[PDB]
Short mmCIF file of C-alpha atoms in Angstrom, two decimals:
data_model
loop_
_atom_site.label_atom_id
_atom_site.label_comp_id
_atom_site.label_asym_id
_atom_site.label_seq_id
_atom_site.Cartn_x
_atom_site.Cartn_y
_atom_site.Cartn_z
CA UNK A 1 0.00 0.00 0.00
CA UNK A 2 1.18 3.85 0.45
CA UNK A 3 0.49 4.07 -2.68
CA UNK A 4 -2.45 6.30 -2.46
CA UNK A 5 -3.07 9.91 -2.48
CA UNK A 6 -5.97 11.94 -1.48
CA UNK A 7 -8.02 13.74 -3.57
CA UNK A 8 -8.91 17.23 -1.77
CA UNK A 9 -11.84 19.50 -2.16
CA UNK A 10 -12.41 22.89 -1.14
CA UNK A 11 -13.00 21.81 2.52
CA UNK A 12 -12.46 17.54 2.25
CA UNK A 13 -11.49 14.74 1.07
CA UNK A 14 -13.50 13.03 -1.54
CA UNK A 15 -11.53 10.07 -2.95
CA UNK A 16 -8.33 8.72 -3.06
CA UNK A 17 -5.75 8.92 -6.55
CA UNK A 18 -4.03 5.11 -6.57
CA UNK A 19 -0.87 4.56 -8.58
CA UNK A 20 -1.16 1.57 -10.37
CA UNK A 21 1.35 0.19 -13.02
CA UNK A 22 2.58 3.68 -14.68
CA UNK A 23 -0.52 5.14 -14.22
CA UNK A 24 -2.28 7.40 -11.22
CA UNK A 25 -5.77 6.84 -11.36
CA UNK A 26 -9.03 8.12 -10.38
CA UNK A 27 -12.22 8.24 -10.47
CA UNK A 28 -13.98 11.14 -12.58
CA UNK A 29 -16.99 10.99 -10.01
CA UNK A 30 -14.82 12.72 -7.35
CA UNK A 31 -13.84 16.34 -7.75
CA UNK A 32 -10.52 17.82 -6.06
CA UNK A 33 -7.21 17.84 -6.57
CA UNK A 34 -4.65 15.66 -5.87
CA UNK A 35 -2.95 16.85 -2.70
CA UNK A 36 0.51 15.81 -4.07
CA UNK A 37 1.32 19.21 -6.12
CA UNK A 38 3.82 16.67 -8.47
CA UNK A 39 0.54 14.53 -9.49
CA UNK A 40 -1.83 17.50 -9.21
CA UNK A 41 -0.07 19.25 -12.07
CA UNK A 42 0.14 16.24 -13.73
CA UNK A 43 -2.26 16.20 -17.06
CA UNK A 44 -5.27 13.73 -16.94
CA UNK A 45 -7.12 11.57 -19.67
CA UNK A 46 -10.63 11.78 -18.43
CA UNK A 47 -13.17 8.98 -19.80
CA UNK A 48 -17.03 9.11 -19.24
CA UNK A 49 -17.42 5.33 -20.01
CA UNK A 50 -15.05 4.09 -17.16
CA UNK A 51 -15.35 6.90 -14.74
CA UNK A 52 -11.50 7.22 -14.61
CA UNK A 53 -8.89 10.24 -14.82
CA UNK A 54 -5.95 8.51 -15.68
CA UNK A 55 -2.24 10.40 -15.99
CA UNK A 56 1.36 8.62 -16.63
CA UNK A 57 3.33 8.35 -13.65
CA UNK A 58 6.04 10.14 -12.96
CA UNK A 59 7.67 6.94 -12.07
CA UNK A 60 11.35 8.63 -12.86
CA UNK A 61 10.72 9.72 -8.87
CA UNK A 62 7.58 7.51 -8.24
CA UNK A 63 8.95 4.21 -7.69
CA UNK A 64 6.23 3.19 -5.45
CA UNK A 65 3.48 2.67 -7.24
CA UNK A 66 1.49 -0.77 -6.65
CA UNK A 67 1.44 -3.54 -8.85
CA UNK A 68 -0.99 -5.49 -10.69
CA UNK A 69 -2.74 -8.95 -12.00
CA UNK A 70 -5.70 -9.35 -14.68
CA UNK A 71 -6.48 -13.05 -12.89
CA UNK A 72 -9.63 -12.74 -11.08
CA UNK A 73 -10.19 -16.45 -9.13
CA UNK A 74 -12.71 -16.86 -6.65
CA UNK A 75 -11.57 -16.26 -3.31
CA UNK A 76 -10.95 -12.97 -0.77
CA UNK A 77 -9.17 -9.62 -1.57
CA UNK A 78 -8.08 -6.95 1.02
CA UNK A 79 -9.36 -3.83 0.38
CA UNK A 80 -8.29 -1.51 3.30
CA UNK A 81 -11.93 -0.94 5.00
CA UNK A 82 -11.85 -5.22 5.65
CA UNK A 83 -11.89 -7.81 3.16
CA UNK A 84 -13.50 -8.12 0.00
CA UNK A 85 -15.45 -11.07 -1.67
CA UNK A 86 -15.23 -12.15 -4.94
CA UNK A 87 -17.83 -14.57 -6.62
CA UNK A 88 -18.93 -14.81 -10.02
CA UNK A 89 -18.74 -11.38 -11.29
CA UNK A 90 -18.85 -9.54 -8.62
CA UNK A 91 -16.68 -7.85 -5.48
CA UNK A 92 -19.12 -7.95 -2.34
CA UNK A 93 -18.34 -6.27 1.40
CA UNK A 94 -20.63 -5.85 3.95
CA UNK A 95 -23.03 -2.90 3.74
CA UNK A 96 -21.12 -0.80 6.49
CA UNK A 97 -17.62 -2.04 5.32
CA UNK A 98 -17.72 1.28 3.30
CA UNK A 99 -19.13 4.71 2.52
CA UNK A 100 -18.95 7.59 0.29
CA UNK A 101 -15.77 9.36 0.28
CA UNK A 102 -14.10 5.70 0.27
CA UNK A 103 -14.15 5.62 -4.05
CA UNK A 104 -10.26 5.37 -5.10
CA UNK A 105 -9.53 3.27 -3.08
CA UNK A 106 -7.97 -0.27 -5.06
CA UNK A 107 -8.54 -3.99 -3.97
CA UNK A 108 -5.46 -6.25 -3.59
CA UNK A 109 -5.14 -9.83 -3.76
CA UNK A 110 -3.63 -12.15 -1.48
CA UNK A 111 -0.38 -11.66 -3.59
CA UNK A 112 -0.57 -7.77 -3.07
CA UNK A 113 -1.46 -6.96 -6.72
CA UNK A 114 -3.67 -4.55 -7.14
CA UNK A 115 -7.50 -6.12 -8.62
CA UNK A 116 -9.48 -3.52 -9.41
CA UNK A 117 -10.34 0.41 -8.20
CA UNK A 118 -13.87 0.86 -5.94
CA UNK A 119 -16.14 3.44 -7.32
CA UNK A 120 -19.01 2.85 -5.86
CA UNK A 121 -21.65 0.08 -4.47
CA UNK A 122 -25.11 -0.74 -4.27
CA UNK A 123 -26.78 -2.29 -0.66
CA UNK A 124 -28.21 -5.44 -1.29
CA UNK A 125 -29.34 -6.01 2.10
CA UNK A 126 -26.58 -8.13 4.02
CA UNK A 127 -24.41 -7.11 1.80
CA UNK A 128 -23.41 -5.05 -0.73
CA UNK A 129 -22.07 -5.06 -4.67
CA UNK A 130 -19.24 -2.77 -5.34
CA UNK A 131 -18.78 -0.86 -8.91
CA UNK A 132 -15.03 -1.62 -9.40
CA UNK A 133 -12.56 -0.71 -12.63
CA UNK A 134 -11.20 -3.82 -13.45
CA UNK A 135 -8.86 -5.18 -16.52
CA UNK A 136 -8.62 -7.99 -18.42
CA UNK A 137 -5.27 -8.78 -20.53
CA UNK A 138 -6.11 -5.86 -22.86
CA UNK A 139 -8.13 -3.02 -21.62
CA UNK A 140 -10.02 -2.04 -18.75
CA UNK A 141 -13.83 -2.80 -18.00
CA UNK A 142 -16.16 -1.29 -15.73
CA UNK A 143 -18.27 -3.98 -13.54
CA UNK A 144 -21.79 -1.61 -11.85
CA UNK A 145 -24.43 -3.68 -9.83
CA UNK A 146 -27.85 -2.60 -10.58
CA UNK A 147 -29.17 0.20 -8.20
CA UNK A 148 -24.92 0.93 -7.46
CA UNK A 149 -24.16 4.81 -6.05
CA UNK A 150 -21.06 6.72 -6.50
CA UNK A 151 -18.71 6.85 -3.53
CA UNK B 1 -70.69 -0.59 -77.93
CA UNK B 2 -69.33 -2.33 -80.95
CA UNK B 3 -66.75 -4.39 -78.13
CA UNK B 4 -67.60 -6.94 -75.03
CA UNK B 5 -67.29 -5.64 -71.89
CA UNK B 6 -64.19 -5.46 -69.34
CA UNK B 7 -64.14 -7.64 -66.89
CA UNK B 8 -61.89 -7.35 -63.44
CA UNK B 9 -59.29 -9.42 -65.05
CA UNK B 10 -58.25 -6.42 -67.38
CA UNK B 11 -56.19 -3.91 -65.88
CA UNK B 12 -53.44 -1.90 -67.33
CA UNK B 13 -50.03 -2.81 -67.37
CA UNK B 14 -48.80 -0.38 -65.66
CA UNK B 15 -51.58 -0.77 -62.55
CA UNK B 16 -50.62 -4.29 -62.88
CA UNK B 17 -46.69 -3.37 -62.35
CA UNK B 18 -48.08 -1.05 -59.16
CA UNK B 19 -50.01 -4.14 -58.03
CA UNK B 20 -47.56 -6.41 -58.18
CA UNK B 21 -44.57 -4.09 -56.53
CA UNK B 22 -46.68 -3.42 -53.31
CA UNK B 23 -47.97 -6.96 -53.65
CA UNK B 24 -44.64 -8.13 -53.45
CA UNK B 25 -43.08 -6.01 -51.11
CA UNK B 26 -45.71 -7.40 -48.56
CA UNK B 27 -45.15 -10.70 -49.55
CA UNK B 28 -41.62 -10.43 -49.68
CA UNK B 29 -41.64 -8.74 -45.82
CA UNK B 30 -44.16 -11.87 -44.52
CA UNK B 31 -41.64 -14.23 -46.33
CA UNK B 32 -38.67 -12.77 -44.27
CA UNK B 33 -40.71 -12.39 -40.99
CA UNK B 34 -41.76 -16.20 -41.76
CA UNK B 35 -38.38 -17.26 -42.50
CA UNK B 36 -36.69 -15.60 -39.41
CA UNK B 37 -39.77 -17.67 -37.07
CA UNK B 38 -39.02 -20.66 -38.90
CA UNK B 39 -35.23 -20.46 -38.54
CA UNK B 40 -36.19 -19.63 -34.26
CA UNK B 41 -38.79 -22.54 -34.34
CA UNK B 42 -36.03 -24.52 -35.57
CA UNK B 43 -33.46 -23.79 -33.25
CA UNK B 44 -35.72 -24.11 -30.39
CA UNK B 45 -36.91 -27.48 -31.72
CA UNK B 46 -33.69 -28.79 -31.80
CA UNK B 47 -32.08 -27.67 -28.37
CA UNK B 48 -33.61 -29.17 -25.48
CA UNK C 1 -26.53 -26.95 3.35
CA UNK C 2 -28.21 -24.05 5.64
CA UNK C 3 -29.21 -21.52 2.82
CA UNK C 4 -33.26 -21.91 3.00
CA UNK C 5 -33.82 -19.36 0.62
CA UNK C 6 -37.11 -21.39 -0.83
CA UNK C 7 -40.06 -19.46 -0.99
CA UNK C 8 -43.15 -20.85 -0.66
CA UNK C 9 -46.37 -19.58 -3.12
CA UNK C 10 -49.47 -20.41 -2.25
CA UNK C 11 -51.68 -20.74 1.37
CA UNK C 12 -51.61 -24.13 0.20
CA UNK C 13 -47.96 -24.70 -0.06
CA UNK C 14 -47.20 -26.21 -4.03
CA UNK C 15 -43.38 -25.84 -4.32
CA UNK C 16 -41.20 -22.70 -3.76
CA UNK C 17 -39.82 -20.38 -5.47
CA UNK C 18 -35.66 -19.73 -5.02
CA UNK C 19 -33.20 -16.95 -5.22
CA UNK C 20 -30.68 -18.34 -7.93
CA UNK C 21 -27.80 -15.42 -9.12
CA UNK C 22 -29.73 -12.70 -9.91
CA UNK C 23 -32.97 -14.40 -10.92
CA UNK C 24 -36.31 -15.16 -9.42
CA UNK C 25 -37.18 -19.36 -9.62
CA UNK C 26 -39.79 -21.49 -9.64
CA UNK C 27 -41.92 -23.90 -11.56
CA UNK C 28 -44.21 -22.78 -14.37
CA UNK C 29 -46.81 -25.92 -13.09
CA UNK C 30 -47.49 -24.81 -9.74
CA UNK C 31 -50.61 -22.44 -9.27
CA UNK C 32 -50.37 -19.78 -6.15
CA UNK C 33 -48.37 -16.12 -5.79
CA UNK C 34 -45.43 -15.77 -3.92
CA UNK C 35 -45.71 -15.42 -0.21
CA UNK C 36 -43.21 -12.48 -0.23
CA UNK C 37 -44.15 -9.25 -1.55
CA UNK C 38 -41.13 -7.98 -2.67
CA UNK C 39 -41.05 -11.12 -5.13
CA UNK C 40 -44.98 -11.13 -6.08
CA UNK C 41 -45.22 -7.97 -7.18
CA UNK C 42 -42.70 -8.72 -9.97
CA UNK C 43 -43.37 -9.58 -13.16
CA UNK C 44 -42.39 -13.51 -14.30
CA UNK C 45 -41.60 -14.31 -18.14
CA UNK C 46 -42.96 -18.25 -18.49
CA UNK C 47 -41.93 -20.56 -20.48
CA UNK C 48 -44.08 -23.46 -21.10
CA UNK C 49 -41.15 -25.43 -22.40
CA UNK C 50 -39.04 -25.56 -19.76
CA UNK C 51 -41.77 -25.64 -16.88
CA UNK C 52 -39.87 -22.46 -15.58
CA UNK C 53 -40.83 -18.83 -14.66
CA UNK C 54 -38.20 -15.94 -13.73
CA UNK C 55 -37.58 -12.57 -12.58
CA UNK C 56 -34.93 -10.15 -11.51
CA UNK C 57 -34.53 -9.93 -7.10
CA UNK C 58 -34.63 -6.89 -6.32
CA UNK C 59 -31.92 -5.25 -4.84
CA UNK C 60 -32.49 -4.97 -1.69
CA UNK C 61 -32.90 -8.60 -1.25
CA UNK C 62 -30.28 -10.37 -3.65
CA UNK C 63 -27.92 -10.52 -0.70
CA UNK C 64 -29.76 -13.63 0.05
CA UNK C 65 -29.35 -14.86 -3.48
CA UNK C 66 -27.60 -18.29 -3.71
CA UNK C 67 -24.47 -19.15 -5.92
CA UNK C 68 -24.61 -21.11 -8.83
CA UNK C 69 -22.63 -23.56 -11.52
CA UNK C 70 -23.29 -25.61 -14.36
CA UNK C 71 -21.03 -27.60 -13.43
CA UNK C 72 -22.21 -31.21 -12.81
CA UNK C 73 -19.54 -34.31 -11.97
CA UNK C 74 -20.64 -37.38 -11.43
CA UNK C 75 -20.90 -38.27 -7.76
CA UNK C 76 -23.06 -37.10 -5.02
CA UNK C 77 -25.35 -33.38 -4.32
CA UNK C 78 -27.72 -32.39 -1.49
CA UNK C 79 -31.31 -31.15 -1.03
CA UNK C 80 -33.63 -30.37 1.99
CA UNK C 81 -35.18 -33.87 1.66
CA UNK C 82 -31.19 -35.53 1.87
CA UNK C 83 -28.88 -36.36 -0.38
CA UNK C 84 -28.82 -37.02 -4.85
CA UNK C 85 -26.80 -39.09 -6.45
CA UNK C 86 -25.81 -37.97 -9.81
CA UNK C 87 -25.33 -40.43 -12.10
CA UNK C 88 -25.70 -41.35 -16.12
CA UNK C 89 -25.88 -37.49 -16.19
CA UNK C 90 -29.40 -38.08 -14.15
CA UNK C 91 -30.13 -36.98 -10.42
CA UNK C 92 -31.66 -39.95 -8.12
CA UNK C 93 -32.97 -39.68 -5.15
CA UNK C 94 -34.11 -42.76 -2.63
CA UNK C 95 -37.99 -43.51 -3.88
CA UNK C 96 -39.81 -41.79 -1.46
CA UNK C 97 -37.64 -39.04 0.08
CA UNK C 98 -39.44 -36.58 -2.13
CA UNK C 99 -43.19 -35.95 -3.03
CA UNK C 100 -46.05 -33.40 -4.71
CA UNK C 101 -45.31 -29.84 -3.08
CA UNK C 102 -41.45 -30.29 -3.39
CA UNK C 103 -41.33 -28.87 -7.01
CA UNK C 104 -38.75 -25.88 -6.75
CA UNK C 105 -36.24 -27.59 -4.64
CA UNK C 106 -32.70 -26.23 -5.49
CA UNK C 107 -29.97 -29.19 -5.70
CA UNK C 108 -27.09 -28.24 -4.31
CA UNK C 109 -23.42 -28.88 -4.94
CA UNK C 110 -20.88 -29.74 -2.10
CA UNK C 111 -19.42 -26.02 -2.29
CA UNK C 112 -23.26 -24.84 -1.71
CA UNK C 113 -24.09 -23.86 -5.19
CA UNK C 114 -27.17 -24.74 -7.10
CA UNK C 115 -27.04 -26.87 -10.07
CA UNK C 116 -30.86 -27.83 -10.79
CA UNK C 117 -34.07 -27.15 -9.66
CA UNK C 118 -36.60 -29.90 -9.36
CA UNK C 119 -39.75 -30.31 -11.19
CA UNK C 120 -40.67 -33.56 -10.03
CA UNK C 121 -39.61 -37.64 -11.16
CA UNK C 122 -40.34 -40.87 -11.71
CA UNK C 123 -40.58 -44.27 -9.79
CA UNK C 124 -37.85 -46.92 -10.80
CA UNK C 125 -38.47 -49.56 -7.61
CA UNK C 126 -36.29 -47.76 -4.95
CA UNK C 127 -34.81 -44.92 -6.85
CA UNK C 128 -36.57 -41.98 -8.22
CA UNK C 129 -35.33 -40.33 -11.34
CA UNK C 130 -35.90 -36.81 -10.90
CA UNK C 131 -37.12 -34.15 -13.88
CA UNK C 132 -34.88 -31.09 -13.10
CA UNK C 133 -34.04 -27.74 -14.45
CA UNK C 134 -30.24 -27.62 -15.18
CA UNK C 135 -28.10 -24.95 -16.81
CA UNK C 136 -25.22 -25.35 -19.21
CA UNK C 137 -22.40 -22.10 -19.96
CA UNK C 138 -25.20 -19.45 -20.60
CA UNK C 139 -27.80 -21.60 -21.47
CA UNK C 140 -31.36 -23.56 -19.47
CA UNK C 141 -32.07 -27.19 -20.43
CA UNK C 142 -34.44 -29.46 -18.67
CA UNK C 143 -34.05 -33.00 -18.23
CA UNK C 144 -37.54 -35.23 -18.25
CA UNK C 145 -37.03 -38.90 -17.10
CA UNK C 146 -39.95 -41.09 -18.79
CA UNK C 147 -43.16 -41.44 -16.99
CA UNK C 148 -41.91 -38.61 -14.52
CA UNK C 149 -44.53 -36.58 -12.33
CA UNK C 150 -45.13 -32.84 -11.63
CA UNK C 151 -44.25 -32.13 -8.02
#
């Protein structure tokens, strides 16, 4: 981890900017700036489709950032707030596992490769379905559970 | 009238050519409609 | 094992209905509304040829949705009225350990995922062939053992 920055408003924080690969990413849903001034003058690709600012990394003097798998088994991920679910298609946590502000935030695997990038969620009762940016070998996908709110 | 009379089954070419290009469009959109059914019917016959 | 997600769906109790993925289950054959609100109030497409009616749960309850597979090995599964052997690509049960009003059963896998539903079966001396709802990758087929009876 340590890998993550926050993403300041005029008076909070509203996400979190993880570096992932060569890339810093966030979510276009959360307004601020980075509150690193070398990544907040750093420029961004925005994209509508996957909700994600993404920038190159300045990885010349950001050495740190996390890395990452495509392989998506069953099984638990760790995702900071507690631990994360995966079945089928989906990322699950328990409905007060997380909360709005929390979107940025990336799940690891048990290998400490970063998974995919929380968004969002929708409660499902017990439980509740997370809207995660994901990749597969080639590109990134966006996975949103019906009824799913930005974070 | 130094003629017979019409009859239904005289109609001018050209009315016919009208008749049968609307006639056949018709057709022609019931035979695809048919044919996609058919081709579902078919399909849904055959897996079980 | 202990998810008793059935529903039943009628005063008279004729089968149940069951939370499988993200769909709504039961029988197309048995008469009666779901006991449930949430899940009567939804609309059900039928399908005569596979004895099966669905729906999407609703958000707020697919929490309580069970996991599925289609896959189906050869050896041994569970229900509420004890155990089903799979073999010969059929599911037998012990003539007897079911009956009428069990139609919507789940089958479940020794990992606690569903693989079929039952409709009902057929008496062969001590064993009972059941007619079940199965799925293959992406796709519904039922299986109908000769002579078999709705449940």
């Amino acid at each position: 981890n340590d890998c993550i920055f926050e993403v300041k408003h005029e008076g909070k924080v509203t996400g979190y900017a993880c570096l992932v690969g060569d890339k810093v990413m966030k979510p276009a849903h959360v307004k601020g700036t980075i509150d690193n001034a070398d990544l907040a003058k750093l420029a961004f690709k925005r994209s509508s489709k996957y909700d994600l600012e993404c920038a190159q990394i300045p990885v010349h003097m950001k050495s740190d950032a996390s890395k990452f798998t495509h392989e998506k088994p069953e099984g638990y991920y760790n995702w900071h707030h507690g631990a994360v679910q995966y079945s089928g298609g989906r990322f699950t946590i328990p409905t007060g596992a997380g909360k709005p502000g929390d979107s940025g935030r990336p799940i690891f695997d048990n290998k400490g490769r970063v998974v995919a990038i929380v968004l969002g969620g929708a409660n499902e009762g017990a439980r509740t379905a997370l809207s995660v940016v994901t990749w597969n070998k080639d590109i990134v996908t966006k996975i949103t559970p019906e009824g799913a709110e930005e974070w | 009238a130094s003629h017979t009379t019409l009859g239904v089954q005289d109609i001018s070419v050209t009315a016919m050519s009208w008749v049968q290009k609307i006639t056949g469009g018709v057709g022609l959109v019931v035979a695809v409609a048919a044919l996609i059914l058919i081709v579902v019917l078919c399909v849904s016959f055959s897996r079980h």
